[PDB]
Amino acid sequence: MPNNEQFDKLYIWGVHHPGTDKDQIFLYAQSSGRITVSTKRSQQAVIPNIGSRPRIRNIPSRISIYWTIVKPGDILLINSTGNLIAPRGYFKIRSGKSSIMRSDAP
Amino acid sequence: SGTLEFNNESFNWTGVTQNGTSSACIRRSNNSFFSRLNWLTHLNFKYPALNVTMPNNEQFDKLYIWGVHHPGTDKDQIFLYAQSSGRITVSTKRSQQAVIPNIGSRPRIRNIPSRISIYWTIVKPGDILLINSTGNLIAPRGYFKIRSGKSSIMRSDAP
Amino acid sequence: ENCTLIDALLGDPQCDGFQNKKWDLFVERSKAYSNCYPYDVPDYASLRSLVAS
Amino acid sequence: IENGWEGMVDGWYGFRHQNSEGRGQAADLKSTQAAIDQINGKLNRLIGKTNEKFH
Amino acid sequence: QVQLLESGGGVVQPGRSLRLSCAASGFTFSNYGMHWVRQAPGKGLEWVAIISFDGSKKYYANSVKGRSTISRDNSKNTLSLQMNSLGPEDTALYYCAKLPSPYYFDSRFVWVAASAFHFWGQGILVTVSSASTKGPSVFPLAPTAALGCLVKDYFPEPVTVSWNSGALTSGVHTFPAVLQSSGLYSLSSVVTVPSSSLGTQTYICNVNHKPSNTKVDKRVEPK
Ligand SMILES: *[C@@H]1O[C@H](CO)[C@@H](O[C@@H]2O[C@H](CO)[C@@H](O[C@@H]3O[C@H](CO)[C@@H](O)[C@H](O)[C@@H]3O)[C@H](O)[C@H]2NC(C)=O)[C@H](O)[C@H]1NC(C)=O
Ligand SMILES: *[C@@H]1O[C@H](CO)[C@@H](O[C@@H]2O[C@H](CO)[C@@H](O[C@@H]3O[C@H](CO)[C@@H](O)[C@H](O)[C@@H]3O)[C@H](O)[C@H]2NC(C)=O)[C@H](O)[C@H]1NC(C)=O
Ligand SMILES: *[C@@H]1O[C@H](CO)[C@@H](O[C@@H]2O[C@H](CO)[C@@H](O[C@@H]3O[C@H](CO)[C@@H](O)[C@H](O)[C@@H]3O)[C@H](O)[C@H]2NC(C)=O)[C@H](O)[C@H]1NC(C)=O
Ligand SMILES: *[C@@H]1O[C@H](CO)[C@@H](O[C@@H]2O[C@H](CO)[C@@H](O[C@@H]3O[C@H](CO)[C@@H](O)[C@H](O)[C@@H]3O)[C@H](O)[C@H]2NC(C)=O)[C@H](O)[C@H]1NC(C)=O
Ligand SMILES: *[C@@H]1O[C@H](CO)[C@@H](O[C@@H]2O[C@H](CO)[C@@H](O[C@@H]3O[C@H](CO)[C@@H](O)[C@H](O)[C@@H]3O)[C@H](O)[C@H]2NC(C)=O)[C@H](O)[C@H]1NC(C)=O
Ligand SMILES: *[C@@H]1O[C@H](CO)[C@@H](O[C@@H]2O[C@H](CO)[C@@H](O)[C@H](O)[C@H]2NC(C)=O)[C@H](O)[C@H]1NC(C)=O
Would the CB of A71 count as within 6 Å of ligand 2? no
Separation in Å, CA of B26 to nearest CA in chain A: 36
Does D44 sit within 8 Å of E103, measured CB to CB? no
**CA–CA separation, E118 vs E106, rounded Å?**
12
Residue of E nearest to D36 (CA): E112
**Beta strand pairing call for B37-39 and B115-123:** unpaired
Instruction: Give the span between the Cα atoms of B46 and B99, in whole angstroms.
Output: 21
Q: Are B135 and B83 in contact (CB under 8 A)?
A: yes
Asked whether the beta carbons of E110 and E33 are under 8 A apart, the reply is no
- Rg (chain E; Cα; Å): 22
- The CA dihedral of E60, E64, E68, E70, to the nearest 10 degrees, is -30
B139, B66 contact by CB (below 8 A): yes
- Do residues C6 and C41 lie in contact, with contact meaning Cβ atoms separated by under 8 Å? yes
The torsion angles phi and psi of E6, rounded to 5 degrees, stand at: -115, 130
Chain D residues whose CB is inside 8 A of the C45 CB are: none
Distance CA E2, CA C42 (A): 55
Domain ranges of chain E: 3-128, 137-220
Q: Which atom of ligand 2 is nearest to the CA of A80?
A: 39
The candidate with the shortest Cα–Cα distance to E47, out of E97, E9, E106, is E97
Q: If we measure between CA atoms, which residue out of B95, A99, E156 comes closest to residue C22?
A: A99
| DSSP assignment string, chain A | -B--SSS-EEEEEEEEE-SSHHHHHHHHSSS---EEEEETTEEEEE---------BTTB--EEEEEEEEE-TT-B-EEE-SS-EE-----EE------EEEE----
What are the Cα distances from residue B158, in Å, to B103, B155, E39? 42, 9, 84
Cβ contacts of C11 within 8 Å, gap of 6 or more: C19
* DSSP designation for C40: B
Residues near ligand 1 with C-beta < 6 Å? A 20, 52, 54-55, 60; B 51, 53, 128
By the 10 Å C-beta count (0-12 exposed, 13-18 middle, 19+ buried), E4 is classed as buried
Within 8 A by CB and 6+ apart from E14, the residues are E86, E87, E88, E128, E129
Burial B21-55, CB ≥16 within 10 A → b, else e: eeeebeeeeeebbbeebbbbbbeeeebeebeeebe
| Secondary structure (3-state) at E173 | strand
What count of residues does chain C have? 53
State in Å: Cα B49 to ligand 4 middle: 6
Does any ligand 5 atom lie closer than 6 A to the CB of residue C1? yes
- Residue C25 Cα to ligand 5 midpoint, Å, equals 26
Between CA E213 and CA E210 the distance in angstroms is 5
Compute φ and ψ for E78, nearest 5 degrees: -140, 140
Three-class secondary structure of residue E163 per DSSP: strand
- Helix (H) or strand (E) segment spanning residue C9: helix C5-10
Q: What is the DSSP letter of E131?
A: -
Structure determined by? X-ray
Instruction: Indicate the residue of C10, C35, C52 with minimum beta-carbon distance to A100.
Output: C52
DSSP assigned state of E122: P
Question: Rounded to whole angstroms, what are the CA distances from B128 to A29, B62, B64, B94, B131?
Answer: 31, 11, 12, 10, 10
Q: Which residues contact E130 (CB under 8 A, 6 or more apart)?
A: E13, E183
D52, D53, D55: best mutation site toward chain C, by most C Cβ within 10 Å? D55
Contacts of D45 (CB under 8 A, 6+ apart): none
Contacts of B146 (CB under 8 A, 6+ apart): B1, B3, B60, B61, B62, B63, B122
Of E55, E90, E107, E76, residue with least CA distance to E7: E76
Cβ neighbours, 10 Å, residue C32: 17
Breaks (C-N over 2.5 A) in chain D follow: none
Q: How many CB atoms lie within 10 A of CB E58?
A: 14
Tell me, rounded to whole angstroms, the distance of Cα B107 from its chain centroid: 22
Q: Is some CB atom of chain C closer than 8 A to the CB atom of B110?
A: no
Residues whose CB falls within 8 Å of the CB of residue B150, separated by 6 or more in sequence, listed in order: B2
Residues comprising chain D, all counted: 55
Count of B-C CB contacts under 8 Å: 3
CB contact under 8 A, C28 and A101: yes
- Rounded to whole angstroms, the Cα distance separating B14 from B25 reads 25
Neighbours of B146 (CB within 10 A): 16
The three-state secondary structure class of C45 is helix
Instruction: Say whether residue A67 is in contact with chain C using an 8 A CB cutoff.
Output: yes
As a three-state string, the secondary structure of chain B is: CCCCCEEECCCCCCCCECCCCEEEEEECCEEECCCCEEECECECCECCCEEEEEECCCCCCEEEEEEEEECCCHHHHHHHHCCCCCCEEEEECCEEEEECCCCCCCCCECCECCEEEEEEEEECCCCEEEEEECCCEEEECEEEECCCCCCCCCCCCCC
- Check: CB of residue B141 under 8 Å from CB of residue B37: yes
Cα–Cα distance between C25 and A20 in angstroms, integer?
Answer: 41
Confirm or reject contact between E115 and chain D (CB < 8 A).
yes
Query: For residue A82, which of A22, A39, A31 has the smallest C-alpha distance?
Result: A31
* Contacts of E193-199 spanning 24+ positions with Cβ under 8 A: E193/E145, E193/E146, E193/E147, E194/E144, E194/E145, E195/E144, E195/E145, E196/E145, E197/E145, E198/E145, E198/E222
Q: Do residues B132 and A52 make contact, with C-beta atoms less than 8 angstroms apart?
A: yes
Return the residue of C nearest to A96 by Cα.
C53
Task: Give the C-alpha distances (Å, rounded to integers) separating E118 from A72, E33, E80, E121.
Answer: 52, 11, 18, 10
Q: Which residue owns the Cα nearest ligand 6 atom 11?
A: B10
Q: What is the DSSP string of A69-81?
A: EE-TT-B-EEE-S
Q: Which of A33, A28, A42, A29 is nearest to A14 (CA)?
A: A33
- Compare all CA atoms of chain B with the CA of A53 and give the residue at the minimum distance: B91
Burial of E71 (0-12, 13-18, 19+ CB in 10 A): middle
Long-range residue pairs from B150-155, CB within 8 A, at least 24 positions apart, any chain = B150/B2, B151/B1, B151/B2, B151/B3, B152/B2
Question: Which residues, numbered 4 to 43 in chain D, qualify as contacts with chain E under a Cβ-Cβ cut-off of 8 Å?
Answer: 9-11, 29, 32-33, 36, 39-40, 43
Tell whether B97 lies on the interface with C, counting CB pairs under 8 A.
no
Q: What would the CATH number be for the domain defined by E137-220?
A: 2.60.40.10
**Which chains have 3+ CB pairs within 8 A of E?**
D
CA distance B108 to B73: 12
DSSP string, E29-65: GGG--EEEEEE-SSS--EEEEEE-SSSS-EEE-TTTT
Among A34, A49, A62, A64, most B C-beta atoms within 10 A, so best to mutate, is A49
Residues E161 and E190: beta-carbon distance below 8 Å? no
Judge whether E3-128 and E137-220 match in fold: yes
Helix (H, G, I), strand (E, B) or coil at D39: helix
Q: Which CATH class is domain E3-128?
A: mainly beta
Q: Do chains A and C touch (3 or more CB pairs under 8 A)?
A: yes
End-to-end CA separation in angstroms for chain D: 55
Spacing, Cα A55 to ligand 1 middle (Å): 7
Provide the 10 A C-beta neighbour count for residue E72: 21
Q: How far apart are the first and last CA of chain B?
A: 24
